C-alpha cells in the first residue's frame, strides 16, 4: 500500500531500478525479486507493446518491486491507460519544454491537479476504497532530459509541479551534442551537462534520475546524489553474460 | 543449406549451443549472432508454448545459429509440427527405453526410415525443391538421458538408428539418483554416470551432449569429448548478471 | 445490412448496450446474444489493446449485437483502423470542444463529408459492393461529455454535423465537479448537469447516451429519454456476482 | 510460503474456490482478491490455452488466492509444465481407473515419490532455496470422477497415495448415467452417486471436492462435508448477471 | 442451426471446402464468404496453435461456411476442446487402424455413443437449449487415410460407426508408397489407391473426401463422386498468385 | 548490409514490392523469397498491430526482401519504434503539407539531420558497430500523396530533404477527387494527377512510388518510370485466387 520508490525517498535513500527491453513475465518477476526497488519496462526502444506490457506489470508487482514504464512517447492517454493497468512510475521520453512537462504532469493526477481520466482498474484492486484520496502519491513521474533543447529549458521543466523531477537519457543527450551515443560516457561535455541537470534538479528541490549501463557507473551516480538510478538493460546484461560464457567455454 | 551442428560434426569439431527459457525474438536473435552454433529453445521448463516458439525459430535462423527445441515431451506429432515450423534440432526429454527412442526417431524421418508426415512449410522455404532428398540430414535428434532407467537402458537407446545420439539432463539425473539437482555437480555418482553415458555413446559411434550451467564446466565437457554442449540458460545468466550489477551498484 | 442501433432509432426506440472491460471473445459473443442492441468494448479503462479488440468485434457481430468501441482517445487514425476492423459505433472520450468534436466527425465519414481513409477491410465483407454509398449510415459516432469544459461547450459540440450526438461519462464528470466519482450518482449538481446535457442534445435534434452501473438506473435513464444506455461493465457485474456467490456459499 | 488450500485443510476448514472459463488477468486478479481460497482455471471447456493460462496464474497469486488448473487431460508433461508455471493445484479430468490416478500422482511429485521433471521456474521464485524439500506439500492434486467407470473404481482410485483425493464433475457424471447434464442437479441417481463418492473418499481418509453452479448449492455441499467446493464459473455468473441487468433495464 | 456440410449431403450434393495454413481471421472470413461450404483450418502443417485457431472458427462461421479443423493428431481431448470452441468438422490425420478410428469416433459423441466430455461453450451459444439432443448431427468427422497401413485396413476403418467416413491425404500416401509427395498426382499406383479408397467408402455407405491442390483436380474429384473436396491451401494459392503478379510486373 | 531498395536505385533500376494486409510470418517469409525487392506491411488498413508486425519484419528479412511498413499514421514515435524493430522502409499515409513531410523526415534521421531517438535494437544487430554512421542510408522514407491538398502542395512536399520522395495512394486520391476508389483506375482526372505527381517528383530529383492492384498495371507503372511499385495486396490476391479455384471446381 505504498509506492516503493516514494518510500525510499521518504526514508532518505535513493532508489535502484531494473530496466527491461525484453517482453515476458518470467524474467520480470525474477529481476523484481532481486534488490531492485523498481523495475522499468522500456516501451520505446524495445518490441514491447501494450499487450505485452500488461502482464509484466503484474509480474513485477508480485516479485516485490514497483512497476515503472518508460513510455514510447509523452502522450497523456497512453500514460493513463498504463496507470490503470498498474504502472506506478512513468518516465516519459524526450520532454523538451515546460509545456511538454505540463502535459506529462496532467496525465498523472486527477482533477483538480490534473486531467487523468477515472477508471483505475488495477490501482483500485491494489489500494482499495481509499485509492482516490491517495492516488497522486501512488505514482512517480519523471520527465526525460535528452536533448540540447531540454538542457536549455531545464529550470523551467523543473518548475512543473505535478512531476517528481527528471530522468536523464544520456545516449540521446550525447548524440544531440554531436558525440557518440555511448552509455556511461566520459565525454566531458556530456558529463558536464549531466552534472548540471542534477545540480539544477536539486536546486529546485526535485528528484533526478539517470540511465546506467553498468553497476560501477551506477554506484558513482548514487554517490553523486542521483535519486533514481537504473542499471542495466536486461538485453545488454544477457548479451554480455552469454559472450562471456561462450568465451570461457571455447577457451583452450 | 546445411545444419550448422551437423557441419561442426562433419568438420571434426563439437557444437556449442545456447539455451533459452525466456520467450521472445529479440534475445533469441541477439544470442544466435554470438559464437553459438545452435540455440536450443526449452519448451519443457519454461512458459514457451508453440505460438511463442514459432517466431523464435525464425529469429535464431536469421541470427545465424541452428534453431533447436528441447520439447515438452517425446511426442511424435508435437515434434513434427516443430520440424515443419523450422526446428532443425530436437532434444526430447525423459527418453527412458529403446522403444521411446524409436518413437523419437520415427518423427524425424520420412518414410521409409520414419513416419514423419509431409508438409514442410518452413524447411521447404529454406532448402528449396531438393529438400525431400536431404531432409533427414537437415535435422539433428538427441534423446535425453535423465533417469536411472535411461542409464540402465543406455546401450539399447544408443542402438536406435534414427537419432544422432543422446543428451544428458544432469539435474534430473542427480535427483533420480537421490542427490541434490545441482547443475554442473561434483557428486561422484552423478559424475560417474555422466562419464559412463559419454563412454557408451562413443563406443556406439553416436553423439553425446550435456546441459551446462557455466562456461567453465562447458569447457571441461568439450575437453572430455562431448559433441554438443549447451551453456547456459538465458534466465540463469540474466539473473546472475543482474544480481552482480545490483551488488556493484549498492556497494559502498 | 443495417447498424442495429441506428435501426432502433429509426424505428422509434432507444438502444441498450453492453460494456466490456475484459478482453476475449467468449463472453463478448455470449453477451451479444442477449437482448443488447450493441456491445461497447472499452479500450480506455481496460487492458484491451488493438490485437485483443479485433477478434472481439467479430464475436459480437456473430452474436447479433452491433460492435461498438469506446476508444482510448479521440484520435482519427486510431478510429479509422477500428472502423476498418468492423467497429460500427465509436464513442470517443474527453471531447471537450467543438474542434475536438469536428476531429471525431472527420474520422467517421469519407470525403467529402470527412477525411476517413479508404480501405474498409471488414465493412466491405459485411455490406458488399454498395458499402461506399451507405458507409456513413453504417457507423454511429458519439462524443463523450465528461468535464466542466465539455459542459460549457455542449451546444457547440452538439452543433457538429458528422456525429450522432453525445455520450455522458458520469464518473469523470462528477470528479471534475469536485464530487466522488460514483456511478449512478445522486449528487444533485451531477444529476442536474446530466439532465442539462440531455435537454440540450434533444433541443439540437441529436442523440444522447449515458454509462450506467445498474439495470435500475438504466431503466430510469431510458424513461428520461436517453437514446443510448449502457449497463453494466462485465468486470463490475462479474465481481458483484462472485461476491454474492461467495457470501451465499459461506453463510451458516 | 504455503498452499492456501492445504492451509485450510490443516486448520480444520474446507476451501472455496472460483472457476474461470474466460481468459485474461484482470478478472482473475479481481476474483482472487475476494474470499476465495483458490481460483481454478478451466483449460478443458474454455478457449484458455497455455499461453493464456500463464499470466493468469501470476494474477491469481498476486490477488491472494491459490492458483489451480483443471487441465484439458490427465497428461503428465502437460501437468508438469503448469506446475513449473506456478499452478499449485491440479484437477485432472476423466480419471477413470487406478492406473490413470497413478499417472496423475506421478506428475505431482519428484523422485522418489513421483517422476516430476525438475526445472521449477516459478515455484523456486515463490518458495526459495528450500523448495525441493517441501515441493510435494506446495501442490494439491485431485482426480476427477465423472463416469460410471470412475464410480465403479472409486475405492481403488482413492487408494492412490500421491493425490489428495477426488473432484466430482457432476454434469459429465449425470450424462454418463443417462440423465440431463444439469449443474446442481436433484436427479436422485446422480445425487446418490455424489454422496457415495464423498462417503468413500472420507472412509479412505482422502479429500473430496465438487463443482457447483450456485452459492446455495455450494453452501449445502460444504455442510455435507465436501473439502473443496467451486462456485461458480465466471462466464455463467456474468451471463446471468447481464441477463438480469437487461431485464431490469427494459422493464416498464 | 445446421451443419452446412451435412446439409449438402442430405440434399444430394457434395461439399467444397477451403483449406487454411495461415493464421488469422481476416482471410478466414473472406474465404468463408465465398462459395465454400466449409473452410478447414490445418493445425498439423502450419504454425496455427489453439490460441490462433479459436478466433478463426468465429470468423469462418460469421462468413457463412462451416468451420472445420484438420487436427495435429487424433487425440480425443484435443478434439473435444476444438468442438467446444466451435469446430463443427474434425479431420484427424494418420488414422491407420480400426482402433484409432474408434478413438476418433469416441471424441465426437456424448455418452452413450461416445465419451465426449460435456461443456459446449460455443455450440450451446449457436444451437441453444436443444443442442444436446442434436449434438452428434452438428459435427462431421472424417478419418484420414494416408499410409499403406491405412489402405490395408480401409474396410475395417470404414466399419466404424461414429465417423462419417474418410479423408485421403494424398501427398503422405504417395510418399509412403515410395513416390514423390506431389499434390494432384498422376502416379498410377497412387491414383489407383485413391480410387480404391473411394470405392470402398461408398461400398460401405460412408463419405469420402480428398485434399486437392487445384480447381481442375477438384472438379474431377467431384465428378468421380467424392463427397468432400478441399481446394486449395491459402498459402499455396497466395504464393502462386504472387509469383504470377511478379512475372507480369517484371515482363518487358 | 545494404537496403535492397536503395541498392536497386543506386544500380539504376526500380524496386518491386509486396504488400501485406494479413498478419503472420509464414506468408511474409514466403513472399519475401520471391522476386520482390521489398515487402510492405500495411498497418493502416489491416488488423496488424505492433505485436504482430514485429515478427513479420524478421520473417521478411530472413526471406530476402527489405522489410517496409506503411504506418497507420505519420507519427514520429510510432515510426521510430518500427525502425528499432527492423523496419527499413517507412511509407507514411496522408502526408498533406510540407510541415507534415518534415515531421516524417524528422523521425528517420538521428541528430543533426533529424530527431530520431537512439536505441536501435535490431538495426544494430543487422549492421553492427558501424550502424550509426550509415543509419540514414539504411532506411527509405516515402510520404504518401492521397488528397487534393497533397496534390496542391506536391512541390513543397517534394522539397523536403530527409525523405526519398513520395508514394501515391490512388484509391484515396480518387475518392477525394469525387470518383470511385477503384484501384488501377482509368478515370482521366485521377490518371492525370498520378502522372503529374510522378513528373513533379522527378523534376525535383526525388523518387516516386505507387500502389498497384495487378501485375499488368504494375508493369505499365514501371515503364512510365515509377521508382517503387507495389503489387498486389496479399488478401486481394488470395481472395481472387480462391474465387477462381472455386469457379473451376464447381464448373460442369
Ligand atoms: O469509464 C468509466 C469507468 O472506467 C467504468 O468502470
Ligand atoms: O478505487 C477507486 C476510488 O477510490 C473510488 O472512488
Ligand atoms: O497435408 C498436406 C500438405 O501439408 C498441404 O500443404
Ligand atoms: O520441398 C519439399 C520437397 O522437396 C517436395 O517434394
Ligand atoms: O490503401 C489502400 C487499400 O487499403 C488497399 O486495399
Ligand atoms: O466495398 C467498398 C466500396 O463499396 C468499394 O467502392
Ligand atoms: O532442465 C533443466 C533445468 O530446467 C534448467 O534450468
Ligand atoms: O528451488 C529449487 C530447489 O529447491 C533447488 O534444489
Ligand atoms: O465442466 C463442467 C462445465 O464445462 C462447466 O461449465
Ligand atoms: O446447451 C447444451 C445442452 O443442450 C444442455 O443440456
Ligand atoms: O534508451 C537508451 C537505449 O535504448 C538503451 O539501450
Ligand atoms: O549500433 C549502434 C551504433 O553504431 C552505436 O553507436
Ligand atoms: Br540481489
Ligand atoms: Br495477458
Ligand atoms: Br546499456
Ligand atoms: Br561471441
Ligand atoms: Br508470430
Ligand atoms: Br543452470
Ligand atoms: Br436477455
Ligand atoms: Br486474432
Ligand atoms: Br460501474
Ligand atoms: Br468476498
Ligand atoms: Br504473458
Ligand atoms: Br454452471
Ligand atoms: Br465464389
Ligand atoms: Br482471441
Ligand atoms: Br497444395
Ligand atoms: Br518470383
Ligand atoms: Br513475437
Ligand atoms: Br487492390
Ligand atoms: K525487490
Ligand atoms: K552464430
Ligand atoms: K442481441
Ligand atoms: K482471496
Ligand atoms: K460460404
Ligand atoms: K526477394
Ligand atoms: Mg533516449
Ligand atoms: Mg531434465
Ligand atoms: Mg470517463
Ligand atoms: Mg466434466
Ligand atoms: Mg498428410
Ligand atoms: Mg490511402
Residue numbers in the entry:
A (entry chain A), B (entry chain A), C (entry chain A), D (entry chain A), E (entry chain A), F (entry chain A): 0 to 251
Copy out sentences from the published article reporting this entry, exactly as the authors wrote them.
Holo‐SwHKA forms a trimer of homodimers, in which each monomer adopts an (α/β)8 triosephosphate isomerase (TIM) barrel fold. In total, holo‐SwHKA contains six equivalent active sites; each of which is formed from amino acids from two different domain‐swapped dimers.
In the presence of ketoacids, bidentate substrate coordination affords M2+ A,S as the lowest energy complex and predominant state in crystal structures. The M2+ A,S complex is additionally stabilized by side chain interactions from the protein environment with the coordinated substrate. With d‐glyceraldehyde (DGA) and HPA in the active site the position that phosphate occupied is fully taken. The DGA is in a similar position as phosphate, interacting through hydrogen bonds with R69 and R120′ from the adjacent monomer. In SwHKA the equivalent loop (residues 117′–121′) is shown to tightly interact with the aldehyde molecule through R120′. Whether these interactions are associated with SwHKA stereoselectivity for the (3S,4S)‐isomer is unclear.
